[PDB]
Each structure stands twice: as structure tokens, then as C-alpha cells.
Amino acid sequence: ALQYFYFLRDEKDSQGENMFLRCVSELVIESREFDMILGKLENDGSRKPGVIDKFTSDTKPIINKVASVAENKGLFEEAAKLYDLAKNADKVLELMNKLLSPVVPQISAPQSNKERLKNMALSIAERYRAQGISANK
């Protein structure tokens, strides 16, 4: 879909350009294919580019838009993912603390040693904290 939308620019001029941008924006929203479209995992090394990024530019504003929406829906994980791309490190940890915090209180029998919110917790800490950590103490 991205490849096709990109053709829209082929008609060079404003209007069409915005139409292209809106179309991409519309694609990201509601398709919710964030990783594919927007990018993924830092391991330092900024984003690993999404397909759109290869095309480039307005990508930060789209992320904020998507992320806020995620907040409405309460699609946590998506929000965390989105904020990572946003590079709002402090925001990420805070949302993150909330996610891990609940699920901690509850009743027992869980927590395999390999994947979920806890695992997510481990990822971020190892990941951010060593590196020039921008988050609040």
C-alpha cells in the first residue's frame, strides 16, 4: 500500500503532496501496522526504519497522533511502542511503570520466564538506562 501511495507524489505540486501525506497518515491509523510502517527497536542505533521512513519525513508528528489515539483506546504496548519511536523516553518508562505495576498486584500463577510486560520491562531498562538516560531519576 505504501508503495502505491507514494506514486501520488509523482504528480508534483502541493495539494497532491498533502493528499499523499494524508493517505499515508490514514494508512498508519486504523491499519495499526506500526512496526512495519513506522519502525522498531532501538538497541541504541535509533530506529530501524519502517517502510515509510525509507520514503521519509513527517513521521514524528504522525507518531504523536497515533500514540495519543492509542491512549484513547488504551492500547497500551502500542503507546509504549509509539513513544519509543517518538523518543519520549521519560514517557515510555512512566507508561511502562504503570503497565508493570498493575499485573504485579493480583493473584499468583504466572510469569513464564520469556515474554510480556515484565519482559518488556527488562528490555527497556537494559536498553535505555545504560545509555545517556534522559529519564527522571
Binding site: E71, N72, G74, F76, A79, A80, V92, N97, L99, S101
Partner: protein, 118 residues
């Protein structure tokens, strides 16, 4: 928090279902209290508020607030039980008696209505 109010809400539902009260006059009072309670719980907020809360839950990035949704869920459970019983009572009642008490019961039915819409 109108938690203390919640208990009265329960008592009200209890009495209505029981349909004790020779007086529809009594039931009109019950309907009125229930109406205010239902209205009070959701201060005028519209779909935007709900969407924002969901996003925040989004997911518990950190510590979320999901207080109003939780309150609505508790109200709706209570109401359900009592509900089937009471719906019967509330509608029949409707008609008659009380063209008066009516103003009170129809309003109660409509508020209730949003919530528990669905």
C-alpha cells in the same frame, strides 16, 4: 467519592424489585434517587473522555487511571441482577399509577439507559 451514595443505590434497587410500598409515592422516591445517582456518576462527559481513558490504559504504560470506567462497571453489575426483577416492576407500574410517579420513572428509565445501553 460517591461511594457512600452507592449503598443507597443498592437499597433503592432492592426496594423497587420487592415492589413493597403500597405507595407508588414511595417508588417515585426510589426512582428519583436512582435517577440522580446514575446522572451523578457520569458527570457530563462524552466519547472523547472514554477514548482518552482507553489510550492511557495503553497500555499501562505507567500508572493509569480507569476510575470512571470501573465505577460504571460496578453500577451496571448491580443493576443487572436486580434488573430483571425490577424491569418488570418498573414497566408495569409505569403505566398506571402513577401518571404521576411517571414523571419520575420515565426519567429513571432514560438515565439508566444510557449506561447500561448497551
Amino acid at each position: 467519592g460517591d461511594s457512600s451514595l452507592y449503598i443507597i443505590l443498592k437499597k433503592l434497587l432492592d426496594f423497587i424489585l420487592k415492589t413493597g410500598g403500597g405507595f407508588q409515592r414511595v417508588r417515585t422516591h426510589l426512582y428519583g434517587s436512582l435517577l440522580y445517582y446514575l446522572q451523578i456518576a457520569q458527570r457530563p462527559d462524552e466519547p472523547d473522555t472514554l477514548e482518552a481513558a482507553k489510550k492511557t490504559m495503553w497500555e499501562r504504560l505507567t500508572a493509569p487511571e480507569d476510575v470512571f470506567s470501573k465505577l460504571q462497571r460496578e453500577n451496571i453489575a448491580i443493576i443487572e441482577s436486580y434488573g430483571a426483577a425490577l424491569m418488570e416492576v418498573v414497566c408495569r407500574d409505569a403505566c398506571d399509577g402513577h401518571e404521576i410517579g411517571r414523571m419520575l420513572a420515565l426519567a429513571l428509565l432514560d438515565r439508566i439507559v444510557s449506561v447500561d445501553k448497551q
